[PDB]
A paper describes a structure:
Here, the rate limiting regeneration of the primary CO2 acceptor phosphoenolpyruvate (PEP) is catalyzed by the multi-domain protein [name] [name] ([name]). Previous studies emphasize that [name] has a modular structure consisting of distinct substrate binding domains for PEP/[name] at the C-terminus (PBD) and for nucleotides ATP/AMP at the N-terminus (NBD, aa 1–340).
Hence, compared to the two extreme conformations of the CD next to the NBD or PBD previously resolved, the CD in the [name] conformational intermediate shows about 50% of the rotational and translational movement of the proposed complete swiveling motion. Remarkably, in this structure the CD is positioned in an intermediate state between the NBD and PBD, thereby enlarging the solvent accessibility of the PEP binding pocket. The entire domain is rather mobile resulting in higher B-factors in this region. Concerning the substrate and cofactor binding site, density is visible for both ligands, PEP and 2'-Br-dAppNHp. Additional density in the conformational intermediate was observed in close proximity of the phosphoryl group of the PEP substrate. This additional density might reflect an alternative position of the PEP substrate in the PBD.
Numbering used by the authors:
A (entry chain A), B (entry chain A): 0 to 486, 489 to 874
The structure:
Amino acid sequence: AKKRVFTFGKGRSEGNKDMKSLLGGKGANLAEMASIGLSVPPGLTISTEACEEYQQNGKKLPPGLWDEILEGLRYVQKEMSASLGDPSKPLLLSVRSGAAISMPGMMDTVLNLGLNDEVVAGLAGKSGARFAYDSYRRFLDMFGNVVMGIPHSLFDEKLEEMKAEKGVHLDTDLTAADLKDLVEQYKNVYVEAKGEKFPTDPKKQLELAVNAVFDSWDSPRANKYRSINQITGLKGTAVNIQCMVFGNMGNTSGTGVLFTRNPSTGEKKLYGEFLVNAQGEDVVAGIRTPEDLATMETCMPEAYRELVENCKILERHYKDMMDIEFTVQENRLWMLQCRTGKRTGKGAVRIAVDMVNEGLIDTRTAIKRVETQHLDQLLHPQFENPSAYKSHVVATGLPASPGAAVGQVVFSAEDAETWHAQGKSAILVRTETSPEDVGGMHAAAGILTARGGMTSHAAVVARGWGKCCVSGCADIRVNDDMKVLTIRVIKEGDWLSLNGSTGEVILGKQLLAPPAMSNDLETFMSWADQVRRLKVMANADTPNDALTARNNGAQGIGLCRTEHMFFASDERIKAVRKMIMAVTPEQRKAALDLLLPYQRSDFEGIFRAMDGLPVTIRLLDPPLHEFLPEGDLEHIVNELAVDTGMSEDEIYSKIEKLSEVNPMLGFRGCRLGISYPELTEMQVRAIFQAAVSMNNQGVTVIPEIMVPLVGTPQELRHQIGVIRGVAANVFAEMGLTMDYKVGTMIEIPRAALIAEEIAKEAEFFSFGTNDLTQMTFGYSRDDVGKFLQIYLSQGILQHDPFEVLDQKGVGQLIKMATEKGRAANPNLKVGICGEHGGEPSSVAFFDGVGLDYVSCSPFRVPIARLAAAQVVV
Amino acid sequence: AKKRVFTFGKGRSEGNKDMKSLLGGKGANLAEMASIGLSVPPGLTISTEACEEYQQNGKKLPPGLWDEILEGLRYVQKEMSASLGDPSKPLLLSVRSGAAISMPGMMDTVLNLGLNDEVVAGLAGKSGARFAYDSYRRFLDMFGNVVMGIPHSLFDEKLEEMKAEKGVHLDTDLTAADLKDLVEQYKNVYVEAKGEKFPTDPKKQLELAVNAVFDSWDSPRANKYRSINQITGLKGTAVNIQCMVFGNMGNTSGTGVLFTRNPSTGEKKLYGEFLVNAQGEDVVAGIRTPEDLATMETCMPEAYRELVENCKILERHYKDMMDIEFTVQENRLWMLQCRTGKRTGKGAVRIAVDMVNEGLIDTRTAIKRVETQHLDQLLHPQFENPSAYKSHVVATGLPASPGAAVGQVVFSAEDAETWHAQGKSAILVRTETSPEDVGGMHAAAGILTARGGMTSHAAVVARGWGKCCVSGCADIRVNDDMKVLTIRVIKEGDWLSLNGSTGEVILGKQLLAPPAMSNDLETFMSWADQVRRLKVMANADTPNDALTARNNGAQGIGLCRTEHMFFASDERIKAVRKMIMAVTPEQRKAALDLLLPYQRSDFEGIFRAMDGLPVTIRLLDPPLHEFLPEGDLEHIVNELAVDTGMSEDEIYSKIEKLSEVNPMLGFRGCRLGISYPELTEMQVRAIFQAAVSMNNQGVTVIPEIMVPLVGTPQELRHQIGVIRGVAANVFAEMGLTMDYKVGTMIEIPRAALIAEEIAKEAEFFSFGTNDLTQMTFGYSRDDVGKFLQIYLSQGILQHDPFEVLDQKGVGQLIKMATEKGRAANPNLKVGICGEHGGEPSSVAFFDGVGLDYVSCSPFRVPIARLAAAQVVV
Ligand SMILES: Nc1ncnc2c1ncn2[C@@H]1O[C@H](COP(=O)(O)OP(=O)(O)NP(=O)(O)O)[C@@H](O)[C@H]1Br
Ligand SMILES: Nc1ncnc2c1ncn2[C@@H]1O[C@H](COP(=O)(O)OP(=O)(O)NP(=O)(O)O)[C@@H](O)[C@H]1Br
Ligand SMILES: [Mg+2]
Ligand SMILES: [Mg+2]
C-alpha cells in the first residue's frame, strides 16, 4: 500500500518542495508554501503515480484511491467547517492539473466545483445574487467543457443569443435575473449535446473531474508535445484540489494585492491595494476603486497582522521581493498566489543591496538579482514618478529599447528629420519600419511601432543606439496618409511619452530626470567588478570618447578605429581626400605628411585620457563610399577637384578605378597597408611619436598596434615588419625606446581555421565579430535588411546575428581560434571589439571560451561589466 | 676498419642505388647506373661518414682515408690506361659534392682537375690548342674559386681587361694565343690574392679539393639551410670523383644527345644528334651543325651498338623514356647524363601505351606517366610539326596556358577587341595585364606578356578559358606607345605563333591542326576511367552544352545554373526584366508565367541530352547587375520602360531599391526563393513537367533539385517544403509520380560548421568552392584583382585561391562538412561544382576527403577524369 493523496494546509503539508516528481510542479509548490507556514487554503494533491495506475487500470480509478481522496476531503472539510453540497456552509473546490514540468495539452483549471441549485441559492445569501449565478454559468461552461467534452462554443452560443435578444454588448450588463435564466440554458446544453444532464452531486462532479485530469495526460495534444521533445520517463499528471475562498462574502471579507517591497523605489514597505467585499476581477476591471493597505490594518487588524507575517515568511524563504494575491474571507487571511515581483531598474539595485545589508542574500546572489535591462534603465533618462501617470497610460507594447522619451508625434521619417533640425524633440510613429529610414530614426527622441517585435527593425536599430523604442503595440492603428493613431484619435504634433523599459505609451508631456548616481548603484557595481573575470575595454576613437569610457569603468581601449578619426574638421577630410586620389607616390607621400600631425595629436590625447591603461590602435580599414560627398557624379567630382586640384578628366577615371562591386570584401583592411606601406608607416609613426611625447610628460602609455582583416599569417608578418622598422626610427630619432605589443584582428573565417599559424606571429587576437558574422553567414550588413525580417518572422533566425552572437556557427570559429591560439602561444591575449562585445548572452559565451577581455561602446561598458559578473555566478 | 671509398665503372659498382645515406644522392646514382651496366666513365665516391670523420678530426683527412682514395685512383687509372700528371696519357678528373638530399651552399662542381703546363701541352696535341688553354683558364678560375676561396671576380677582372685591350665583346673571339697568355695571368691571381701559387701536382690538387668539399658542408650557407628546414641526422656530404672524357680528341671521337624515343610523336626509335670531334658546348652554341644518329652508326659501328645497348638498359631499368648525353672518346662510348625525357602531350600517351603493350609498365604506372598538362595539349589545337619551326623560335617564356594560336600582333586590349569583330585572329601582347581588360583578352586568339609568371593575371584568366598564353618572357620589351617587340624589331600586325604548352613564341604563320582522337588516347583514358574512384559530372546550363559534356565523358550534370538560362534571346531577358521590376504580386506571377515555357523547354532538352544520367538543377541565384543594360542611368532606364511599360518615375525608384553595396553577400541565392516562393514554385514546376514529359517519351530522367547559398537548416527546410508541394501538384496534374532527390549547396562557411544539422534535411551536398573561397578569405572575386598580384609576388599567397583549392583553410571546411554530413546521414552524397572541381591538385584533395563526385566545365571533364585516376595510384 502506497500513499497517493497528500493534503496541505497552513503549516501542515504531507509532501514537500522537493517532490516535484510525485506531486507535479504546482503540487510540490503548494506543499512548499504550506510547509513554511503560509496561509494557503487547504487542499490535497493526487500523486502522479495515481495517474499511472489509472492508465494501467483501463482509465478507471485504481483500488482504494477514491477512499484515499475522501479521507483528504474530510480534512479540508474540517479545516474549513464546510462540506460539499451543504447549502448553509458549502465547500467549493478548484481542480487543477500539473505535471513535473510545464506541459501543454493538459486539463485547464476548473473553479467552483461543488455548485448546484441548492448551493448556489445559499451562496447568493452571502455574495450578490449576480455573483452566485454568474459563478454558476461559468462552472457549467467550464465543467461541461473541460470535463464533459462539450465544446465551449455551445454555451457561448446561448450567451450571445441572450445578449443580442436583450440588446447589450457586454456581459457585465446582464442582470442577475438574466444570469439565472442563462444558468438553465447552460444546463440544457448538457442534454442537447450529450444526453446526460449536469451532475448535481459535488462528489460525482469531483470523481468525473479527477478522471478528466488523468485522461488529459494521455491526450493527443499532450502526447504530441512529449514525443517532439524526446522526454521519456514521466508517469502522469497530479491532481491539485484546493478550497475556494472569496472576498465578497460581506464586510469582514475582501481582496487585495501587494508587493512585499516597493517595485518602483525598493523601499522595504509593503506596497499594494485592498478592496472590501469584492473579487480580484472587480479591481482590475475598474468597476470599483481599491484602497491602500493601510486601510486594511485599521479595519481588519488580525487579518493584517497575519498578512504581515505571511510576507515575512515569503522573503525569509524565497529570499526575494514577492508579488502576491490575497483575500480575506470572513476575517481569515488566505494566500492565493505569490511570485517574484517585477521591479524597476532603480528598484532592483535598491532591493538587491538592502537584502545584502539585511544578510538575507550574499553579494553573489545580488549580482543576479539585477538584470542587464534593470541596469540599462539607470543608464538612460527616466520618468520621475512611474505610477503618477498610471492614469494616462493608453496602451502597453513591447519594451524594445529601454529608456524614456517625450516629444511631438510625426508619422514619417523625413519629417522627423525636418523637426530635429528645427530644435524640437520628435516621436516617430510608423506601423513598421525598414532600413529606408535609418536617418529619420536617428533624429526621433523615441520610436513607436504598431507591427513589430523584439527582433523588429525598429527594436534592433533602436537598441544599437540606446534610443527609446516601444515596438509591436497591437492596440495602435497608424494611418500614414490620414495621420491619426486610434488606440481616442491622436493628432500629429501632440505630446506623447514613451517608456521603452515597460513598453508603456502615455498621453502628454511627462517629467523626465537625468541618469544620476546613488550609493546603492555604486555599491552594487563594485560587487560586479570584484567578482568579474573578463576585463572590459572600450571602443573609442576620440579623446572625449575615451574619457566617457573611462568614466563608465573602461579598463582600457580594445579598439581605436583609425578610419573614424577624420570626421571632425573639413581640413581633415580634405587631407584624407588628398590621399585617396593620389596616383604619384610623391603626391601620396605628400598627402600622408598632411595627415601625420592629425593622427599624432589625436593619439596623444587618447593616451593622456587613458593614462595607465592599455590602448589598442587598429591600422586603417576605410569605408571609402563614406568619405565621398552626396549628389550627382556631376556635383560630387567638382568637390574632389576643389580639394585635390587634379584635372577633372583625371579625377573622373580615379573614381572609376576606385569603385568596387563588394567593398566589404574588397580593397580594405590590411590589403591597404600591404599594397601601400607608406600608409602604415605614417600611422605607426604618429603612434610612437605620440607615445614618446606623452611618456616624457609622465603619462603611462601602454600601446598595442593591430592589423585588420587578416586571413593569412603572411599578411600579418608583413605589417609587423613595417611596424618594427618604424619603431626603430622613432625610438632612435627621439632617443627613447618604448615597450609595445603588436597583434591581429580575427574577423576572417580563414584566420580562425589556421589560428595556430597566426598565433606564432601575433601577441594577441581580438575577434571582430561584425565581419566574422558577415563572412560566416554571407550576410552583407548594409544589404541584409532586404530579407532579415522575413527570416526572423518565419523562424529561420531567432535573433539578428549581428546583435546576438551565433554560438553554433560564429561561436565555433571563436572557440576554435582561441583554443588553437593559446595552444601555440601561451602568452597570447584574446579579446573582442565587435558589437557583440557588449551583448550579455554574447559576453557569457566569451567568458565561457576563456577570453581575457571584451570591448564595446563607451555607453555599453557598464552593462558589459554586469554581464561579465553574472556569468561567473 | 670501415670502408669509405667506393669505386664505380661499367658494370662494376662497390655501392648500390639504395645507399643514398652513405654515398649521397649523386653517388648512389652513379653506383646505380654503373651496376645496371651503363658505360659511365670510372670513378669513386668518398662516403659521408668520411666527411664526418674529417670534422671530428679537426678538418684534417682521417687516418688512412687518403691511402684508401689512392687505391681508388689506381683503379680509375687502370680502367683508363691514364695516370694523373702524365702529359702523354693524362687522367683528368671531375670533383662533385653530394649529400643524401638536395642541398644549397654545397661545393660547386670542379672540372678538369689534373691540369698543368705539362699536361695542357699534351692535351693540345689531341684537342685544339684553344681548347686546352680555354680549359686551363677555366680550371684555374674554378679551382682557385671553389677550392682556394679566390673570388671569381678576380679572374674575370683579368679576362675583361684583355677583352677590352684586344677590343672584342665575346670570349669565343679570343685566340688560342690570347688564352695562353690569359692562363699565366690567372696563375698570378693566386699569388696576388693569396701568396700561394697554383698547385701543379694533380694529387695535391685532389687533396685540396677533397678538403674543400668536406669544408663546404660546414659552411654558413649550408648550416643556414639545414637549420631552417629542421633537418637533423646528416653526417656530411660525399665526394664524387669521376674521370673526364672528351669528344674532340680526333675523328674517332664525338659528342651527341638523344631521347630513347621520339619526344614529339612517341615512336620507339632513338632520336638525337651526334657531332664528330666536338664538345656539347659546340652543339648548343651554334658554332657547328650536328648530324642525325644514323651517321654515327655508319662511321662508328661498335660505338653505336654499345649506345643501342646502353639505351636498352636504361628503358629496362628506369622503365621510361630517357633523355641522355653521351660522348665517344677515341672509339669508346661514355654515358654522361641521363634523365626522364620531356615529351609532348601526344608523345606522352603514345609512349605510355606502347610501354604497356611492351609489358614494360602496367596501366597503373602508365596513368601517372601522362601529366594533366600533357592531356591538356591534346584537348586544344596543336602545331602540325613541333620541330619544323625550331629554326623560327625567337624566345621561350613560361607555358602559362596550354594550347596553340596564330594571329597578327596588337599591343592593346581595345584594338584586340576591334580586330576580332572584323574577322581576324588577334595575338594580344602587353608587358603585363590587369582586370581592366578581361574583355580584350576574351577576343585574342593568344596572349603573350613580358612581365608575368605562372600566377600572373594573364596566366590565370587564360587557363580559366583554355586560351593559349605565354607569360613572363624576359626576352621581350613591349613599347605600348612605340608598338614594337625587341627580342629584331617586331611590327604591329605581323603574324606571330604562340605555343602555350612549351612557352615558345615563334615567327610567322604556323600550321595548326585540330584536336583529334587516336587509339592510344582512347585506350589511355579507358584505363583512367576504370581505375577512377570519383565520378565526373559537368556544369552545363544548355542542351548543347550538356551534349558537349557527355561527349567529353561526363557522367551526369552536377550543376545546372538556372540564372544562366536566359542569355540566348531578347524575348528571354525581356521576360526576366519583367519580374525583376515587378512590384504587384499579380505582375510578379504574370512575369513568372511568361518564363515557365522557357524553363520547361530547356529542362526537357537537358534531360534528353543526359538520357539516363543524373541532372542536378540549382534554384535561382541571379547576378542582377549582369541583367541590366550598359550606358548612363538615362540610357539604361529607357530600355526597362521599353520592356516593362512601368512609369519612368516607378522604374527609377525600383533600381534605387534593387541596388546593393555588396551583392555577393546580399539578396541572392535561397534568400530569393524564401522571400518570393512564387519564383521557386515556377522553377520546380518547369522541372517536374519536363521530367514527366521526357519520361513519357522513354527518357530516363534522374533529377535533383538544389538550394543555393544556404547557411542554416531552416533555409533549406523552407525551399524543400515548397518543392514537395509543387511535386504533388505536377505529379497529380500529369498523372505520374517521379522519383527525385533534393539537396543543398555548401558554399557558406556556417553551413560547414553546422553540417550535421543540414545533413539531416538534405539528400546531398555539393561544395560551391567559389563563394566558400570568397567567404573564407573575404576576397571579392570581382574586386580581388586590386591586390591579388601584390600578394602573389610578395609570397603572401602561392596560388590564386579561386583556382587552386586552399586546403589548409577552405579545405578544412570541406573536410568538416563531409565528415559531419556522413556521420549524420549515411545515405548522403557529396560533390563539387566550384571551379576547383576541374583542377588536378584540388581533385586529389577531394578524393582524399572521400567525395562521391566532382563537376566542372564540359571542356575540363577529361582532365578531371585523369586527375581522378592519378590520385588513386
Ligand atoms: N483556492 C482558490 N481560491 C480562490 N481563487 C482561486 C483558487 N485557486 C485558484 N484560484 C484562481 O483561479 C485562477 C486560475 O488558477 P491558476 O492556479 O491556474 O492561476 P494562474 O497562476 O494565473 N495560471 P497557471 O499557470 O495555470 O498556474 C486564478 O485567478 C487563481 Br488566484
Ligand atoms: N666525367 C665527366 N666527363 C665529361 N663531362 C663531365 C663529367 N662530369 C661532369 N661533366 C660535365 O660537367 C657539367 C657539370 O656537371 P654536373 O654533374 O654538375 O651536371 P648537371 O647534372 O647539369 N648539374 P647537377 O644538378 O649539379 O647534377 C655537365 O655539363 C656535365 Br655532362
Ligand atoms: Mg573589421
Ligand atoms: Mg554560389
